[model samples]
Target: KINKIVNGTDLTPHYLSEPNKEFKIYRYNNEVYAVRFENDEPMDYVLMWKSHKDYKELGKGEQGTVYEKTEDKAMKVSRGRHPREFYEEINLHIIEQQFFLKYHGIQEHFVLGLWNIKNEENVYFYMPKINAIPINKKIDQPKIEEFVLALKELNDAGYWHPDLANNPYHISPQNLIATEEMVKTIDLDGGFRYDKGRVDELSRKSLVYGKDQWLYVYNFIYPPTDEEDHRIDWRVPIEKWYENNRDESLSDNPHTLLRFYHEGLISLPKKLAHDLHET
Candidate 1:
């Protein structure tokens, strides 16, 4: 909430050379402002446009808040102790964009650029808002199949979402958006190249044990509610695909059914027996 007000406000507008520049905190009129600095001294006045009050909140998360700046653009600001993860997401988006541009022309992932605010704990970035539907919201079985196919294509492109490329456990309905042609993935802070990121002992165990992580893309979205309680028959689409592939395997992996159905690697190596055994 605003605490104070500025009377006789200056109507003139000014532009900064660097919008992404980090600044110290300054308060005026009960509203928070980002104070720019030269050498060690603070500027005379705050950059009014840099204030968080200028944007409207769209969603909130533990790391930060998503704010609406205009009809086409949105901003995500880090909350606290999250600046590193926030920047990692910024870099992740770049890698995805470059990877897809080389192979696939049609894609609808995040196109992010960095920005900042007065709060030292919180960092900010902007992206263009696209028209799509989140997967966890009201998606049907057919949509799940569509996304499954899309994800397979993504893996084939030689990229892996550190978490999502393995499973949909942490995937929010808001993160996976369904566009007209494909399932557009957002929120890449959990994403990285296949061998990248600092993998821990638990992660290695999780991959082998299927502890919240699924082996295949379809497996991630399949098994809707519960096998015993089949309310909407959501598993039919996935089941059909599974059966079809079981009858005839796909490219690359000859033992597709075993890999897709069993708890194993999707891309099997030439010396597959070695990888199957525990290290």
Candidate 2:
């Protein structure tokens, strides 16, 4: 019995365009599993099983470690002793994949792809290697502006990166990769799809998307230097800057208003009463 399998990386470089090399056939096990051109590329599971241990560690994170798989690709491996932790990491990648599938327009803003690899107890996913400097070490105004616009596009596409929005500075600079061309969001473990049905659920809980998260980026990139007065709170100016620059129509949606109420920025006593009454 011959088993046919489809496999390869760099399958879909452009979200809207078809892959150059459609699909290649491979033989594995006794059954045939044809992997077509989808959002995520399929690899020969057996081959990955053998070659998984050949990568060198690139970096480490809370739940996973990135490894250089090939010249143009990297794999994120789960880093935990417990099986449950492994599954949790796997689920996060699955969610990441779902986000890419839904928001094709925002695909290039990420590392791209959920080229999956699995064994008995561990699971990992691969993405194109991003050869860029992390935003933490270097701050470029033009690149940061591009990054902010990219975040805006992501929010426009209807997903919110909660970890990015709710973090200490509202954005973890280290998780942002900056190149000359664009900025890419890394570690999308806590991303949420707020469009279809989850928007209502998120609103009921008074959660907001990453619409204003760019304000934090601006604050970081343009903080008050030592030459300027240190006592003046930098955040105030940053907030005002965002207020002046942001697209007014997209900035003040119902969710943004709800967030204002939740943070006590605006009085909503009667509105809250009406919501309670309706519920």
Candidate 3:
């Protein structure tokens, strides 16, 4: 996997032939950097490129627009108020890939290259084509659990994505790719490296995929006909899983705030627990 990221593939050609695009503003450290725009459209930001007709737009979202440069490659340019954070996110992904490649022999998750150019102000980058199919209306709960377990194992490799909790957009079925062999998450921009941070107890709990969010997706995707049995034979409730697996370092077995609350591991405020229906 590590070798695949280093030398098995490259995207220099697609990048060198990219088209001219535009960005909005870049916000970082309380400062805002502006870019030119037309008709108040969302964003078309690209720092460099030759012709504007070279790429085909696949889709657009809060993050930015994605372009299908080739069957095997795609590109994303920021469409937000913070272009620099977009850049920072890409840099973090690069760091993540390097870390995983060095220590765990893993390939880059999704991002491929950062498209840096002279006089370019907007943030943009390339990624491998995600050959992902939409989650089927009738889902296999066991399959979903397998993926959650894989994502958990991914954390065991020393990375955590805080955004996976609550925000279904982070790793929702909509955000997942049901490949032929395995299910996987895309858009790893929010992934945080675990070893370098001041990870307090609460902060650590916030990083793991939350059980409420997990149940939300499970029920959301699986139809009513398949409702009764969402759990696999060996599946443990969140609290039981944590109590059995917690070994001091959170990396050993991550827990979620929702789980902690459920198991009496962490007490919540009166209003908070009531609002969340935890009581």
Candidate 4:
């Protein structure tokens, strides 16, 4: 959906926050850039942010952290129908009033936004650079709470984090950061009904209630379970759902290198097929 297309070329993206021991890092615009990491098998995903070359030289912005603007960086870049003024609202303002404002003295970390900016007909989102080595590599415990907590606040204000991943170091650490830290959240797909639930206090705040716990995860927190709780759905079902019905949707294993090899080996013309599997 939010696929990368820079200088008219498609990119192969790897998740930004995963641990890759054999990854390659390149230099773009003087800053170091690491696209994919090693040890990430069956790898396929999007890069965390856009590279300098991705923008096609629209023009540099105020600093390195934020490279350039789209010239026609109009708020309507994505929302052509909505008034440009409407797109300018990220709802962070409303979120502050709803959550962060109340937690003013809580010294912690958070990952929040693609912080946006626009000049007339042009629309652009602000992004910060992720430094060397991921946060998971630097700390004793991954600051998942930071992301979870921040998203909880946003969800309370009626937003949810659709794509949560490990971020660059220097992000928030729940019960982690001694003082304060601000994280830059990017390439968001937006939230669902974070504000749809009840908030009677007795009903429990769905978004921010349990954002301070930590865990290693491989998928979305489907209506995520909370701090004092872990959802049963997160576990693998002992009985496969695809069984008996022979349902292809649940039955598909996705052809792999070996399956492909086996298929191709059998599909090959007789002359070339012999001894292919043995030799």
TM-score of 1: 0.47
Q: Which stretches in model 2 have alpha-carbon errors above 4 Å? A: 1-54, 80-106, 115-120, 134-139, 167-170, 189-206, 223-250, 253-279
TM-score winner between candidates 3 and 4: 3
Scored by lDDT, the top model is 2
* Model 1 Cα lDDT, one tens digit per residue, 1-279: 111222223221111122323233333543333343455544333222223336778777643577887666677765446544455444434434444533454344433233442344555555555566544534455655545444545555544454343433344444566666556656653333443343685544333222212234444454333346543332344345545643221423435434443433232222332434442
Model 4 bad stretches (over 4 Å): 1-82, 91-108, 111-118, 127-132, 135-142, 145-159, 165-185, 188-193, 196-233, 237-279
lDDT tens digits, residue span 164-225, model 3: 43423344344566766556565654444354454776545444434334433443453222
Order by TM-score, highest first: 2, 3, 1, 4
Better of 1 and 2 by lDDT: 2
Better of 1 and 3 by TM-score: 3
Best by TM-score: 2
Query: Which window of 10 residues has the lowest lDDT sum in candidate 2?
Result: 44-53
Mind sharing the TM-score for model 2? 0.52
For candidate 4, what is the lDDT?
0.30
Report per-prediction Cα RMSD to one decimal.
13.7, 12.1, 14.3, 21.9
Each prediction's TM-score versus the true structure: 0.47, 0.52, 0.49, 0.31
Provide the lDDT at 4 for model 2: 32
After TM-score superposition, the amount by which residue 252's alpha carbon in candidate 1 deviates from its true location, in angstroms, is 7.3
Clash pairs, model 1 backbone: 4-29
lDDT (Cα, 0-100) at 96 in candidate 1: 42
Candidate 1 C-alpha RMSD relative to the actual structure: 13.7
**lDDT of all predictions:** 0.42, 0.47, 0.43, 0.30
